[PDB]
Design a protein around this ligand. Structure first.
Ligand SMILES: [Zn+2]
Length: 279
């Protein structure tokens, strides 16, 4: 039962340089490949450097490069050029995380749109798929994508949390959908239960978004409250259940989808990497 975690924020400070153990626990749990998410030029560089530092063969760790809407305001005159270079690294497999977040509004909206469009333009010219974030902005995101979609090899709406109409609109644009532990959240994720089954096989992928979105049904829960990619099987369990399919079958098809979407290569216990009650 191999799984692929399409979005790990493995450079996060909150991991306090314990990425090696985190990766070891993931592999041991059968999460055999992971996409390390870039959220700014600096964090995209660090994500790539982590792939290089931890995984010399290029079998397990890959990166995305992009600028997140929270950080769109840092998009500047040298951004396009630096990102184009980073994207041409072979371990870098997608453009993103990029998109729109009108809930937080941590960058002005026009600056968000500007950064998004420049990244979609790069994705189109470089023939790389897009890793999208959207929150309270489905209407703007759909309008923007309309002019790009025909020119993209593909795009995923990562960590989809919205309602039926938004889902079907994304599906109608032929977008992939990524599902996280938000689905295990009894307070805000139950509305996904009737929806996950509408995502065709071949368009559904899974992701932890670690350290965020620790599945609320997990046990034992880490005292830190940090999510990690080894907890992805709890997401698989819940997604399989509401799709009415075996865990083995959901695992198989999401993994095949992710391999294709990111162009990943085919397949082929330690005590130090399982500290108990870690800070
Ligand atoms: Zn996101």
């Amino acid at each position: 039962m191999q799984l692929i975690d399409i979005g790990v924020n493995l450079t996060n400070s909150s991991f306090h340089d314990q990425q090696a153990a985190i990766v070891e626990r993931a592999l041991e749990a059968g999460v055999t490949q992971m996409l390390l998410t870039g959220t700014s030029l600096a964090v995209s560089e660090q994500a790539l450097e982590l792939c290089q530092q931890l995984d010399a063969s290029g079998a397990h760790l890959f990166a995305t490069a992009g600028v997140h809407p929270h950080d769109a305001k840092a998009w500047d005159t040298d951004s396009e050029r630096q990102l184009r270079l980073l994207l041409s690294e072979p371990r870098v497999r997608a453009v993103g995380e990029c998109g729109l977040d009108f809930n937080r509004d941590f960058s002005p909206r026009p600056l968000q749109e500007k950064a998004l469009e420049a990244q979609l333009t790069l994705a189109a010219q470089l023939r790389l798929p897009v890793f999208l974030h959207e929150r309270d902005a489905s209407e703007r995101l759909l309008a923007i994508l309309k002019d790009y979609r025909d020119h993209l090899t593909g795009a995923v709406v990562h960590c989809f949390t919205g309602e039926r109409e938004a889902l079907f609109a994304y599906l109608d644009l032929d977008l992939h959908i990524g599902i996280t532990g938000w689905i295990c959240d009894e307070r805000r994720g139950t509305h996904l239960h009737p929806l996950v089954g509408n995502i065709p096989e071949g368009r559904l992928m899974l992701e932890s978004d670690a350290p965020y979105l620790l599945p609320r049904s997990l046990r034992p829960k880490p005292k830190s409250g940090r999510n990690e990619p080894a907890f992805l099987p709890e997401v698989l369990r819940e997604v399989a259940l509401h799709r009415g399919e075996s865990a083995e079958h959901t695992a198989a098809h999401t993994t095949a989808t992710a391999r294709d979407f990111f162009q990943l290569p085919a397949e082929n216990h330690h005590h130090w990497s399982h500290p108990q009650f870690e800070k």
